[PDB]
Amino acid sequence: KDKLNPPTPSIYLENKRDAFFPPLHQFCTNPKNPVTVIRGLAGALKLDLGLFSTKTLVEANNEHMVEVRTQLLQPADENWDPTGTKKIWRCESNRSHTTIAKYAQYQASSFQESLREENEKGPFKTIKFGTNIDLSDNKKWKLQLHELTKLPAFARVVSAGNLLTHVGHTILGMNTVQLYMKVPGSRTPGHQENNNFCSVNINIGPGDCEWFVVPEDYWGVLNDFCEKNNLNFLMSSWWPNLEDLYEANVPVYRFIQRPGDLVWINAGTVHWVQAVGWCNNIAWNVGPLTACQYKLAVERYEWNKLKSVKSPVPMVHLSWNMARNIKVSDPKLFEMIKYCLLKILKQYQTLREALVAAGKEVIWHGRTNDEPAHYCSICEVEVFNLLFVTNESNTQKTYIVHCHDCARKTSKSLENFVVLEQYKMEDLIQVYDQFTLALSLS
Ligand SMILES: O=C(O)C1CCNCC1
Ligand SMILES: [Mn+2]
Ligand SMILES: [Zn+2]
Numbered sequence: 001k002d003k004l005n006p007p008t009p010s011i012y013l014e015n016k017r018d019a020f021f022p023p024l025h026q027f028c029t030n031p032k033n034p035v036t037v038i039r040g041l042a043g044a045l046k047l048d049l050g051l052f053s054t055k056t057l058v059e060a061n062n063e064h065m066v067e068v069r070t071q072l073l074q075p076a077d078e079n080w081d082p083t084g085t086k087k088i089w090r091c092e093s094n095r096s097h098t099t100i101a102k103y104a105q106y107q108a109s110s111f112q113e114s115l116r117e118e119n120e121k122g123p124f125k126t127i128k129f130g131t132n133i134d135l136s137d138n139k140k141w142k143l144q145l146h147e148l149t150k151l152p153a154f155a156r157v158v159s160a161g162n163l164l165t166h167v168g169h170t171i172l173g174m175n176t177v178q179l180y181m182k183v184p185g186s187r188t189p190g191h192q193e194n195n196n197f198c199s200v201n202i203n204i205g206p207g208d209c210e211w212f213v214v215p216e217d218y219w220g221v222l223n224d225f226c227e228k229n230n231l232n233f234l235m236s237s238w239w240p241n242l243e244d245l246y247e248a249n250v251p252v253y254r255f256i257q258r259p260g261d262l263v264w265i266n267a268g269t270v271h272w273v274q275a276v277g278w279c280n281n282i283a284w285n286v287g288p289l290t291a292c293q294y295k296l297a298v299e300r301y302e303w304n305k306l307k308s309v310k311s312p313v314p315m316v317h318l319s320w321n322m323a324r325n326i327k328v329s330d331p332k333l334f335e336m337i338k339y340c341l342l343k344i345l346k347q348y349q350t351l352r353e354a355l356v357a358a359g360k361e362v363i364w365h366g367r368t369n370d371e372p373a374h375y376c377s378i379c380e381v382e383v384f385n386l387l388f389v390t391n392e393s394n395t396q397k398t399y400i401v402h403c404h405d406c407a408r409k410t411s412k413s414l415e416n417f418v419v420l421e422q423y424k425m426e427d428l429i430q431v432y433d434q435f436t437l438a439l440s441l442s
Pocket of ligand 1: 180187188201273281283
């Protein structure tokens with residue numbers, strides 16, 4: 001079917017006017033567009049991509065850590081089992097660490113070596129992919145991060161309309177920038193973004209990347225495929241067989257990202273990517289204030305619990321911050337947030353009264369300014385307001401957080417734990433009561 005190889009939603013920018021034109025923002029965040037490729041973005045804004053060249057990076061922070069993925073150089077769009085007998089979903093991808101200086105050396109000699117060969121089923125060559133380079137430190141990366149403030153607001157790392165800005169604390173690689181250093185064949189295997197948040201990716205060049213994209217509403221189909229190939233959709237490295245997806249009638253968007261092109265991945269869009277040439281990429285996440293984004297984010301948050309996977313975005317904490325600090329005028333988005341908060345409030349009230357009825361002291365603990373959300377030290381679920389801390393950890397003021405279930409499993413009557421409360425119930429009830437639909441004519 002021709003509908004199984006759809007055209008890429010693509011926008012061609014010439015100048016700053018095109019980049020700041022409001023319909024660009026609305027096109028990207030439109031749920032009907034699973035991905036938007038903003039071509040010519042860097043040139044349109046006169047972004048200095050040279051600030052992210054490998055030469056520039058070595059000079060700035062040569063001992064900076066790089067996560068290496070050692071992979072096989074696979075042909076085109078395929079993934080073969082090590083023997084070259086059949087195409088499979090499972091990806092070989094071993095992890096190690098290096099530095100920018102050391103990876104840069106490899107990146108350069110890799111190119112020099114291919115130049116020489118050019119002038120001279122498997123088996124497959126091994127390559128190294130430099131991933132997840134952390135560009136959060138504004139002191140180490142001052143000029144780099146300043147250049148990215150030249151983007152239109154909706155695509156920035158930080159903006160008033162970015163849900164991740166409203167989290168109130170750092171979520172590494174989501175509201176901070178990640179850098180990738182690549183050689184041909186460097187693969188980012190299949191995935192959805194952390195808690196289905198949108199993502200921004202800019203190719204630094206000089207080489208191209210090739211992207212494969214599947215709309216959000218087909219993700220269950222890909223989840224089935226993983227389970228049938230004994231793979232964990234969320235935690236395994238997998239590279240879809242295109243002939244399998246075609247067979248199962250899954251449409252696949254396919255395109256080339258050139259240097260300076262910005263790729264916007266909409267919420268929950270499934271995708272995998274490979275370098276065609278030698279290049280660097282930068283990326284981060286963004287959370288538009290839309291019903292679709294909030295809905296998919298909450299869904300994945302709950303799915304992660306069932307799968308025993310930690311949510312990088314603390315959706316309970318975020319939901320309270322939205323109610324505290326954001327005027328919400330979309331009736332659909334408002335009703336979702338209101339609903340979630342009511343769930344949180346009722347569960348908290350239920351737990352709190354069960355504790356008080358069993359004669360357990362709830363200790364007023366309050367909270368520090370700009371203090372991050374808490375997760376259970378055992379099971380890594382988000383824990384909100386009522387924190388379960390051992391008598392000893394309390395005494396030592398290390399305040400090591402457990403959820404209620406994990407505390408109970410350890411200590412049947414919670415005799416080994418104190419219950420800390422970070423918010424008065426009156427304060428949360430008030431925040432909820434005062435959270436009402438704002439009027440907007442837009
Ligand atoms: O440039 C890359 O390898 C990536 C693209 C999309 N998500 C994660 C990584
Ligand atoms: Mn991604
Ligand atoms: Zn727990």
